[PDB]
DNA sequence: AAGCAAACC
DNA sequence: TGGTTTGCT
């Protein structure tokens, strides 16, 4: 039972305005991992809204975190569309709370605007510590956080290490879990719209699962 | 924004 | 496999 004020009057909020008719098939959807109260994205953005009409700042993983035990998933969006707003108070000494937000309620809807957003950015700033995560996560066997490790550099465009990118797809190459081969072949997609060459290089040289060659060259293959 | 792609099966 | 639903940048 959640004691921030902010998390209560949230979970009152949005249980009023539930939709069983919509949880079922949201549900589904999840694989019915999770419970849902049918609150999709846009009605989910404007609930938030109603509530903010900000906490202190010392408060934001305290609430995070209430909002992460309780049972519902529109609960976990909605922190993380909180997390948000508190952008430009998270920084390196936050990434064990974001682990803990990959490993706990983990499915690829949250680790998914996790990963390449928030630890994204702050790798950006650190890159120095990236040595102290990656291997780390690569080597605990934890789908969610080795998806993270694929997935950090999804957004960098030209500031992508391509060297370490590589290494690391490199490291899960030969995992034979969906939501691994998928990210290799995602981030390898992604980043091939930005430097095409070095990723075709590296596929027609590199060991891959085929899904994740085929979903890396989807859209250059025709110029090679 | 709308061009894109995560899921889903 | 590739069409559908939903949501991000």
Redesign the pocket.
């Given at each position: 039972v959640p004691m921030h004020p902010f998390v209560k009057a949230l979970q009152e909020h949005f249980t009023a305005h539930q939709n069983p008719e919509?949880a079922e098939?949201?549900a589904?959807?999840?694989?019915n991992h999770f419970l849902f109260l049918g609150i999709?994205?846009?009605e989910?953005?404007q609930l938030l809204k109603d509530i903010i009409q900000l906490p202190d700042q010392k408060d934001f993983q305290i609430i995070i975190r209430e909002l992460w035990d309780l049972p519902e998933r529109e609960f976990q969006?909605a922190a993380?569309?909180i997390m948000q707003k508190y952008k430009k108070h998270i920084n390196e000494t936050h990434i064990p709370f974001l682990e803990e937000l990959i490993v706990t309620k983990s499915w690829?809807?949250s680790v998914?605007?996790i990963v390449?957003?928030f630890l994204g950015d702050i790798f950006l700033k650190h890159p120095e510590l990236i040595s102290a995560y990656i291997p780390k996560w690569i080597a605990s066997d934890n789908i969610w956080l080795q998806?993270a490790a694929i997935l950090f550099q999804l957004?960098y465009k030209q500031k992508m290490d391509e060297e370490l990118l590589f290494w690391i797809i490199g490291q899960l190459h030969s995992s034979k879990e969906?939501?691994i081969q998928?990210?290799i072949?995602?981030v390898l997609?992604?980043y091939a719209?930005t430097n095409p060459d070095v990723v075709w290089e590296y596929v027609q040289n590199n060991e891959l699962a085929p899904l994740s060659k085929r979903?890396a060259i989807?859209?250059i293959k025709q110029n090679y």
């Open positions: 919509k098939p949201m589904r959807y999840m694989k999709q994205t846009p989910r953005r969006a993380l569309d690829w809807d998914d605007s390449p957003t998806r957004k969906f939501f998928k990210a072949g995602w997609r992604e719209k979903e989807k859209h």
